[PDB]
Amino acid sequence: SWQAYVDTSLLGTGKIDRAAIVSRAGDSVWAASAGFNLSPQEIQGLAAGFQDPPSMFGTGIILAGQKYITIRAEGRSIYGKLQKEGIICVATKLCILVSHYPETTLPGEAAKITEALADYLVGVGY
């Protein structure tokens, strides 16, 4: 299940405290961890971000009612920071992985893990 990816593969690392998997077109949430609610406006904006990544620097990244400073924005990867916390968003063929990381994990760790789950999903065809 997509929930199994959120629970086991992302949250189960101990380095990502909140996660979601959303359609790549930004029309729905396929799976999300408890209390991490991404509005239709937020996922549509993020999806639009992958189609015009330089624009994400001006707007920042708004997810679950919180704005993050845009640190990386490219075709498949959009990263944000909020002090020592942040989010990693990676587009696969069919989905977008969203990973929030807390104070105690390095951005590099969180990026590495969700980039990896992304390539895996691309390899499988999703």
Is residue 111 within the footprint of Na ion (CB under 5 A)? yes
Helix (H) or strand (E) holding 23: strand 18-23
Question: With contacts defined by CB under 5 A, how many residues of the chain interact with Na ion?
Answer: 4
66 sits near Na ion (criterion: CB under 5 A) = no
Q: Candidates 25-33, 73-81, 99-107, 118-126 — which segment interacts with Na ion by CB under 5 A?
A: 73-81
Give the bridge partners for 97, in sequence order. Answer: 21, 90
Residue 32 has phi, psi (to 5 degrees) of -155, 145
* CA distance readout (Å), 14 to 17, 29, 88: 7, 22, 15
Structural element, H or E, at residue 90: strand 85-91
Q: Does the footprint of Na ion cover residue 112 (CB under 5 A)?
A: yes
Listed ranges 12-20, 92-100, 106-114, 117-125: which one lies at the site for Na ion (CB under 5 A): 106-114
Residue closer to Na ion by CB (options 32, 110) is 110
| Candidate list 2, 36, 60, 62; residue touching Na ion; CB under 5 A | 60
Amino acid at 3: Q
Applying CB under 5 A, the residues found at the interface with Na ion are: 60, 77, 111-112
